[PDB]
Amino acid sequence: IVGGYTCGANTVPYQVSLNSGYHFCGGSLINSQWVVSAAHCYKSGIQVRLGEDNINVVEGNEQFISASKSIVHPSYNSNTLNNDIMLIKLKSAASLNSRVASISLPTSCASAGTQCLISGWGNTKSSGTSYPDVLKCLKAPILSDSSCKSASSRIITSNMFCAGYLEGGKDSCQGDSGGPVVCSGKLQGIVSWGSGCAQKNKPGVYTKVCNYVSWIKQTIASN
Ligand SMILES: [Ca+2]
Numbered sequence: 001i002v003g004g005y006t007c008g009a010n011t012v013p014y015q016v017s018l019n020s021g022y023h024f025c026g027g028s029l030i031n032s033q034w035v036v037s038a039a040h041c042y043k044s045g046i047q048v049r050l051g052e053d054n055i056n057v058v059e060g061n062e063q064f065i066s067a068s069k070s071i072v073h074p075s076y077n078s079n080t081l082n083n084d085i086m087l088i089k090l091k092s093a094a095s096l097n098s099r100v101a102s103i104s105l106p107t108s109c110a111s112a113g114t115q116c117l118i119s120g121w122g123n124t125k126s127s128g129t130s131y132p133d134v135l136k137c138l139k140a141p142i143l144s145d146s147s148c149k150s151a152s153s154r155i156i157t158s159n160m161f162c163a164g165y166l167e168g169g170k171d172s173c174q175g176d177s178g179g180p181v182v183c184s185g186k187l188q189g190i191v192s193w194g195s196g197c198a199q200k201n202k203p204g205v206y207t208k209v210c211n212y213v214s215w216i217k218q219t220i221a222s223n
Pocket of ligand 1: 052053054055056057058059060062
């Protein structure tokens with residue numbers, strides 16, 4: 001997260017960190033046994049870490065649970081990042097409490113101008129690299145489809161949406177991928193991609209969760 005702020009310990013209870021000996025992606029807890037993340041974050045041997053703030057020190061409230069299976073969307077395309085969504089089933093159900101809670105799926109898509117909360121442990125600098133210890137937060141609005149398409153003609157506004165600041169300086173970044181974009185208490189996006197980070201006229205692109213709700217439910221129900 002570039003240009004964001006420190007969220008505060010466990011203020012984003014549904015935020016998950018995907019770990020493979022180190023933090024590599026974010027995710028969202030949607031129920032006691034399922035996490036939603038980005039398909040390009042797929043990897044074997046994933047350990048899901050819930051209730052995290054400082055990812056480098058055990059502070060209490062953390063729950064480490066291995067992934068029993070990762071379900072990448074069948075139509076995911078690694079070149080275009082279209083359908084960049086993945087479901088992760090936990091080996092055991094997480095213990096839900098005040099510091100570890102799930103986030104609700106949307107019943108309708110969000111409109112341009114809607115303010116959202118994006119969070120993660122990704123790179124905090126536009127130029128160079130700098131990974132934080134604690135969770136970072138960023139409030140950002142969803143942009144209009146016209147602006148999103150004029151920013152890059154490689155997006156499919158049906159499965160993607162732009163959010164952020166065209167003036168640059170505030171954006172999600174490397175390491176935030178798979179993370180949540182929550183607006184009005186509903187998970188509307190998944191950190192997917194972007195051209196650089198916090199660059200002028202280059203807003204972040206996110207997976208449009210509202211158009212995957214049916215798939216999510218059907219997939220979870222059969223697994
Ligand atoms: Ca920790």
